Amino acid sequence: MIILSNEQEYVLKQVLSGVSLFYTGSAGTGKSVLLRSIIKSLRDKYPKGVAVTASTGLAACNIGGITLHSFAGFGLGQGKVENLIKKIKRNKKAFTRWRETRVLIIDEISMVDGHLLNKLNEIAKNLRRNNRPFGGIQLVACGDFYQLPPVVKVEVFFAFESSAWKETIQRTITLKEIFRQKGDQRFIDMLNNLRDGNVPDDTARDFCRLSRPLKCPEGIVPSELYATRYEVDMANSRKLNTIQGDVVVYNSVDTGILPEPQKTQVLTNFLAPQVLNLKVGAQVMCIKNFDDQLVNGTLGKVIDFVDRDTYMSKLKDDLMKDYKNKKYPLVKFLLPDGITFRTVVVEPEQWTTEDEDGTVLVSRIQFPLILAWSLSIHKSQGQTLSKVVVDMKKIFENGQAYVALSRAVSRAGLQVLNFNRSKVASHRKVIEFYKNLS
DNA sequence: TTTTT
Ligand SMILES: Nc1ncnc2c1ncn2[C@@H]1O[C@H](COP(=O)(O)OP(=O)(O)O)[C@@H](O)[C@H]1O
Ligand code: ALF
Ligand SMILES: [K+]
Ligand SMILES: [K+]
Ligand SMILES: [K+]
Ligand SMILES: [K+]
Ligand SMILES: [K+]
Ligand SMILES: [K+]
Ligand SMILES: [K+]
Ligand SMILES: [Mg+2]
């Protein structure tokens, strides 16, 4: 599909030489595309020893991986390293993975906290009896620190400040050619100006001119980016509430042996929704990796709701809980090829909080769907969007404007609402980082 | 005001 540039090939060459490194570049410079090639090559060599990870769930799906937290076995990794190590040792699946890992890839490194990275460093050494940096694991960090910083409640501790980073990262390589907006050089200039936070008048004016409504085909739906979840949930709601069709309500079956409030506080953070509201034609996103083609993050469109089964050791212990309501959603999913579709009948799935031995502590049964329509700027980081409307109203964080506006392929498929330079800012420590790279 | 099980 894609020929790697000579810059992309040079990075790949360094990674295959075993050097622990961080490679960076502006939004859309082909970092993740290269990363997928790195993965393929590194896995010919170490078939079971390449750990693919990203800071967020959606950015991990973009490279066929899992979150950094999920790879570790940390849960949230909040306590002290002495306790985190015991927890990981109880998870014999994660403990084995820590010892069999040869390369650790972390995409979207900007959102990885340096304190988390220092714990991962100490845990790597301990579990592997290896005093090398990261216990001998080759660290491959990939991302852009002008993009979103680690999420906080200076408290913000960037990854490049950690002692782990300084003793492990041996080389930094910068990709310079921007592919996502390559057709529009002015657009690239405007996006680049946002990086350091200083926005010239012409760039600011050129973004305000994008407030014009987008005109799209009948079936082309533009993605909506917002800073907060309230907006995302409201934007999904208003879109659903305009569709007629007597909205179908799917309540989740929530069980568990944990006491309260612990059980409620665990369920609150499940991606699967407690109440899934669906109409006909509602935009949706799959949140489970079913197939090699239909994976977590795949966008789709619901066409109908009926199945009385006619439309043609623990598993059983969990099938009893499946009352099967009466009706499954019929959803047509745009496959990861851009054009073709695949319609499938979406069955309910189970998400479990468990203990290392296998005893499920909390269970939620729900269809693996969320009304997609809208999306947080945080979760957009890493995505490419052909047609997108960005509402900068509640932007509160450094690099959030830059990430949001840089998701677009072109200005013709981008609408910007409530643009303001006050919303465009970068962290002092990020700017000094990139200026020291000389 | 966001993300991470
Ligand atoms: N070498 C290349 N040639 C052509 N297009 C590319 C190349 N590398 C990346 N792209 C395109 O650029 C877009 C963004 O690339 P991505 O890997 O998401 O960059 P980053 O991760 O740095 O944002 C993708 O749609 C991809 O198809
Ligand atoms: F740097 Al990106 F999508 F990962 F623009
Ligand atoms: K050893
Ligand atoms: K041009
Ligand atoms: K100016
Ligand atoms: K213009
Ligand atoms: K059900
Ligand atoms: K907003
Ligand atoms: K700001
Ligand atoms: Mg990327």
- Paired sense of beta strands A299-305 and A103-107, if any: unpaired
Question: Are the C-beta atoms of residues A60 and A52 closer than 8 Å to each other?
Answer: yes
Strand B: positions under 7 A of a protein C-beta atom: 1-5
Residue of minimum CA distance from atom 13 in ligand 1: A180
Token pair in block for residue A344: 């499938």
Residues with CB under 5 A from ligand 5 (ion): A 200-201
Token pair in block for residue A317: 């212990």
The closest nt to A268, taking CA to C1', is: B5
Cα–Cα dist A27/A146, whole Å = 9
Question: Are the C-beta atoms of residues A304 and A381 closer than 8 Å to each other?
Answer: no
Does the annotation place A412 within a ligand binding site?
A: no
* C-alpha dist (Å) from residue A270 to A69, A94, A267, A351: 15, 21, 5, 8
Work out the number of other CB atoms within 10 angstroms of the CB of residue A351.
Answer: 18
List residues, Cβ < 7 Å, touching strand B: A 55-58, 66-67, 69-70, 74-76, 111, 151-153, 227-230, 266, 269, 353, 376, 378-379, 394, 396-397
Q: How far: A98 CA to B5 C1' (Å)?
A: 18
> Could you tell me the resolution of this structure in angstroms?
2.6
Cα–Cα dist A435/A437, whole Å = 5
Cα–Cα dist A413/A376, whole Å = 18
